[PDB]
Structure formats: structure tokens, C-alpha cells
Design a protein around this nucleic acid. Structure first.
Lengths: 116, 71, 177
RNA sequence: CCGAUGCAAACUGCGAAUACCGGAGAAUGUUAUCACGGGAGACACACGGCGGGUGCUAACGUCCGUC
RNA sequence: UCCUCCUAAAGAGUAACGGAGGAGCACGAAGGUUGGCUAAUCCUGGUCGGACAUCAGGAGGUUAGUGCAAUGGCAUAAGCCAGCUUGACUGCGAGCGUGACGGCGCGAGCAGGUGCGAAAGCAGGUCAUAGUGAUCCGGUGGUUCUGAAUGGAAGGGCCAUCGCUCAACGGAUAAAAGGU
RNA sequence: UGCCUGGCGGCCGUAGCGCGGUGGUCCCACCUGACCCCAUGCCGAACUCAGAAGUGAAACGCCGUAGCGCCGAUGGUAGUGUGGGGUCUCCCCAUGCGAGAGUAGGGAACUGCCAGGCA
């Protein structure tokens, strides 16, 4: 039981952010690919989504899943958010550990000038 | 081989309960706070903003939730 | 690692030829070995349990963890949370080396070596067995023996039937019953 | 104790009528509704119908919620 | 004095030394927060262990537990390992649920400063329902607030507050206890 | 615009339980070693580093199996508000509201958005 446990643990922040009703940045991690999505408080629409699989950002990346790919995805998410006007979304770790690629992506996103 | 406590629902669905009003005071947790509803230490549900009350059934266990929506 | 390559080369090939499987890893693989002590005689003395744990740590590549009791019953005169024994889990290069050394030196030299008891199966594939006289293992010397203690070695088996476990045991020719 | 058949005030995987809270609505009711002030009066009620407890599921016995 | 389900006729309330006991404690850690973990029960394998002194493969998912007698809800566990602290801090606080009053409980939210985190956010004691003390009386520290002419002193007025089993627990005058 | 895979929401048994088949194009899955960021109340158990070198074992997407499980009618049944009657402990009459279970029927769900492979 791994995916079920991951979903259960992420459910904590998933429900916690609901009360405050703020746009949330969620990250899905996989060795093959990494995904980042911005979800509105209603939880049925995504403001913007990026994936390491897409060639547009995988051309300059040797492999889809790595620290460099996570940093590139973070930069892309940050610039798209800046040009869209997200207004300082909150973020959720999706039950992961904030020490490796998740931390690298968060730092890359914050480097653009975000205040989350 | 005492004084009875006042239980039950004070405000039902459709009541325009304002902020701070307690919806129900039960022994345990008969219903769970939903949106704009807070739960106290003594397992008491109270409103957080003005609106209309509603009771809903959701979840795999089919648990009763108390919610408040804009009027 | 050291023995995994030989296992893949020989045991997997033999099992595939025998059973006509499709997936390369269709043959069940051993995940972990759990070393346990069922002595249950350290209630009176704690130094006995401490010495047994030290011996387990010395023989294995990692030290054990003391395990407490689970339920309290007046019949056996036991309370709740009473530390009696400990367990060790081996999975990886250490497990492969331990299994190789065992099957190489320890198994042949056993008193009353009538053979392994195949009937001692959990009914699904996992095999757990215990033997006495840890002195057989070279990692413990006669000069440092406090008492006779038994072992409990249980191997992980992902099979859904006892035939797979029997085939895995016969992989090393299963000397006899 | 294994499975089943019936039963329950400190039994409900279900679930009435009835009572009660809020929203909208044609019509009636001398506002019959609520807020403040002055004046009081009363502070051992009885019996009956409706559903019960108690009582020996004997009593024109006993106490409750409603009319 | 106070709680636990019924009788009590599906809002609350609704009887007769009614059927039932428990608390008048305790944790200054059993409090807060971050990560992960979460069964009980039964079969099968172990030197004995067979289920019952410990371990791993299964049947099953909240039947174990939640400090207490009992009670409701609790797997997002309201439990249970690793780590750090005292937010059990201070002024407060719109509103709501009860009451005949004295008052009681919950409570969004601001400010001064803190702990848990990278942040989102939590922390105004303990999962809760009982677990306590009101009026008066005596003691501690602050105030020139007041001071029977002046400057002090004595004495009062308010602020946190110990004793008062005041355990006749809303506590009736200064009136000491037991009985045939 | 059609098929397949992963994620984000509603629905919470018409989504579940048991059985057979199919899935490596992409996606997802087993992780070998870790002296390096990370750590075990022992264990690289989980988490973190490099993918097709090894495969679809287990998990999971889909089709059928209506075997178990669920909902679900109209109808009837038990009950009750209101006025009356009787043999008044209980029942009936005119009228309104109406149980549970089961039968007919269904389903192996459906739906909104984003990313990728084949068309």
C-alpha cells in the first residue's frame, strides 16, 4: 500500500487548504516525469499545468526526470503564473518529502519572485 | 442501589444564522463542520460567516456534514 | 549481488524450464529473511536477553531491536509491554551473504541431520524453521557461549501456492526430508 | 461455542404519522405579534378523553405530556 | 454539589429515597505542533509456543482504544514512535446556546511577544460529558487614588491573590454537642 | 475529431465483493548499489539519486460472468392527526398522510478539466 498511503497523507493539506479557499500548487513526482498543476479553490479547474514530458521544455533537458528538469518546470510554472496573475497561490507537497527534487522545484519557483 | 442538559438542534436548515452562532450542541460528533463552519473543543459546531445553513451527505462512509452557503 | 547473478543464471533457468513460465520474474523471489529468537526464557534475567542480542548483532551485519509484549494474560504470568525478545530483518547484499554462508557451512553440520521438514510450511509459500546450537555458526566461538539457544529463520515468499516454495527449496537440491 | 429461527428500557444495515425551525404564497382575523412603563390579581386545583410509568399488566389506587 | 442511558409520547423540557453507579481526582505532562505509522480478532509456521512469554504469511478493517464507573462520535483516529518547546502567556473579544438572578459554556477576529515548520497553518490546557467555592472574614505586593490645615503617618478604594472540606457545597442571626 | 494511459473534482455500493481474458505504442509498475541530500524505534521498511540493462511478477486501466451485494417502483400491509361509535384492557367508521422486506427493472457505472502515445 503505497499510492493509497500517499493519497491519504496528501489529503491532509488537500482538505486544510479548502477552508481558506486559496489557489493551490500541487506537484506529482515520478522518476519518468514530473507534473505541476495550479488548482482553483473549487477544485474542478486547473489554472495552468506543466509536465516534463512535453518537448517544449524537454528539448534542453537530457532526461525528463531529474533536478534540472524540476528546476526548469519550476521556472516555467513561475513565469506562467507571473504572466497570468495568480496572486500568490499557496502550495502543497502532495505527501512527498521537501528535501530533494520537490525542494529544488520550490526554490526554482520562488527564484522568479513569488511570495508563497 | 440533577439538571438535564439542553441538547438538540437549535437552528435548522434555511435559517439565516450569522457569524458566531452555534448550529447544534451535541454530546459527541453527530455532524461534522463543512464550509464556513468551525468545531470547538467541546465538539460544538458554530458558523463563521452569515449565510444559509444546509445538511449534506457525502463520503464513502456517508457522513453528515453541516455547511453554510451564501444567501 | 554476489549470489544474485548465480541465482538468476541457474535457479531461474531451471524453474523456467521446469514450469514453462512466460515472465522472466515469474519465478517467486525471496525478499527478506527474519532472524528471531523463540527462547522465551529471559523473563527472569535481563542480562541473558542482552547477551543474546549482542550475539545476534555480532553474527549479523546489524544490531537487533528489543521487542515488547503484546497482550497480558494471568495464565502465563505476563504483563503488557514486557521485553522478552528481538528480531533482525535482512534484505540485500547482507542477506545474500548470510544465506550463502549458512547454506555453505552451517547446514551440513547438524546433529541428527535427518533433513529439512518440508511439512513445516505456512500453507502459502513462506518457510520458517528453527534449529538449536548456534555454536554451529562460525561467527560464535565456543569460548563465548553462555547457554544453548535456538533460532527462527523465516524467508519471504511471494508465491500463491506451496508448489513454488517446494521448487525454490529444491533449487539447492533439498538434500533430503 | 458453529449456523439458524423469534424477542428487547442503558439494540438499529432501514424508517412513519405527528411536533418543531426557516423561506415563499391567495384569503380572513377590530394587530389577534413584539418593545417600554403603572396597576394588579394568583402561588394545596378537581375530573374526563388521548399514550404511558407505578401498582399483583386485580383496584372508581398513584404520577406524567397534550385537549 | 455535579455527571452518566431509559422510562420521557422521533426540537428542548416534562414523576414519585425511579431504575443505575461514579467524581469530588489526576496529568505542570497524559499540553501544542512536524514526519511517518495505525489494528483488534482467528488459522497456519517456528527450540517450548500450541492462539495464549517473542517473530512472519494469511482471514478481516475499525469488534482493540479514547486516564477514570458509565456514555458518543472517533482510520482524515479524537491513537502512537521519533523531536523541540510551554499558547495552560497578556489586553481582549463581535456573536451565539442557556438561564429567575448571581452568572455558566462555545466563539470568529486585532494587538505585544513566543513554540512547532520550508511554508500553508496550529497553539487562550488535557477528546469531551462530573471533578469544585460564591458572600463574609484574616494575610502578601502596587497605587498619594483618597488623606478631617500644611508635609508625613494611621486608616479606607481598586488591582493578582493564599487560608476559609466555608464537602450545611447559593453557602439562613454572635449564639455547643449526643439520647431513651 | 476517435482509441489508450496518468493527474485534478463531483457522484459514494446503478462506483463494491468473487471468477476468466487483455494492456508495454505512450504512461504506470518491480530498484539493482548507495561509502554521496535523506534514514531505520533492526531492515534503503517508506522516502532520495541513474531507465530500458532485465519484465508486466504483484499492483492498477478495460471487456464479460447479474454468482454475492444495492437501489428500486405501483400495489398492499402495520400505524397515526382530526370527529364519532362499540362489547371501551382494545377495535371500527368518513377523510388526509403513509412502514420495513420482497417482486417487475437496473447496473461489472457516469460525468467536467489538464498532460502524453496511436489515428
Amino acid at each position: 500500500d503505497k499510492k493509497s498511503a500517499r493519497i491519504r497523507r496528501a489529503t491532509r493539506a488537500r482538505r486544510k487548504l479548502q477552508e481558506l479557499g486559496a489557489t493551490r500548487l500541487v506537484v506529482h513526482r515520478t522518476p519518468r516525469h514530473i507534473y505541476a498543476q495550479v488548482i482553483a479553490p473549487n477544485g474542478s479547474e486547473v489554472l495552468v499545468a506543466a509536465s516534463t514530458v512535453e518537448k517544449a521544455i524537454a528539448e534542453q533537458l537530457k532526461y525528463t526526470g531529474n533536478k534540472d528538469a524540476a528546476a526548469a518546470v519550476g521556472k516555467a510554472v513561475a513565469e506562467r503564473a507571473l504572466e497570468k496573475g495568480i496572486k500568490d497561490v499557496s502550495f502543497d507537497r502532495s505527501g512527498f518529502q521537501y528535501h530533494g527534487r520537490v525542494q529544488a522545484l520550490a526554490d526554482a519557483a520562488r527564484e522568479a519572485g513569488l511570495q508563497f | 442501589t440533577s439538571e438535564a442538559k439542553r441538547l438538540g438542534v437549535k437552528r435548522f436548515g434555511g435559517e439565516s444564522v450569522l457569524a458566531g452562532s452555534i448550529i447544534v450542541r451535541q454530546r459527541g460528533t453527530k455532524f461534522h463542520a463543512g464550509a464556513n463552519v468551525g468545531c470547538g473543543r467541546d465538539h460544538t459546531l458554530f458558523a463563521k460567516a452569515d449565510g444559509k445553513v444546509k445538511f449534506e451527505v457525502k463520503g464513502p462512509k456517508n457522513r453528515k456534514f453541516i455547511s453554510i452557503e451564501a444567501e | 549481488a554476489k549470489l544474485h547473478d548465480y541465482y538468476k543464471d541457474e535457479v531461474v533457468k531451471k524453474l523456467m524450464t521446469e514450469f514453462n513460465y512466460n515472465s522472466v520474474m515469474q519465478v517467486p523471489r525471496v525478499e527478506k529473511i527474519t532472524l528471531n529468537m523463540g527462547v522465551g526464557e529471559a523473563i527472569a534475567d535481563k542480562k541473558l536477553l542482552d547477551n543474546a542480542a549482542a550475539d545476534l548483532a555480532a553474527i549479523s551485519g546489524q544490531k537487533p531491536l528489543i521487542t515488547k509484549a503484546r497482550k497480558s494474560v494471568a495464565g502465563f504470568k505476563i504483563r503488557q509491554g514486557y521485553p522478552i525478545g528481538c528480531k533482525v530483518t535482512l534484505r540485500g547484499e547482507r542477506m545474500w551473504e548470510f544465506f550463502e554462508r549458512l547454506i555453505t557451512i552451517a547446514v551440513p553440520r547438524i546433529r541428527d541431520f535427518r533433513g529439512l521438514s518440508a511439512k513445516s510450511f505456512d500453507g502459502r509459500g513462506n518457510y520458517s524453521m528453527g534449529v538449536r546450537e548456534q555454536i554451529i555458526f562460525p561467527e560464535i566461538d565456543y569460548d563465548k557461549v553462555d547457554r544453548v539457544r535456538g533460532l527462527d529463520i523465516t524467508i519471504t515468499t511471494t508465491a500463491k501456492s506451496d508448489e513454488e516454495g517446494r521448487a525454490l527449496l529444491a533449487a539447492f537440491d533439498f538434500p533430503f526430508r
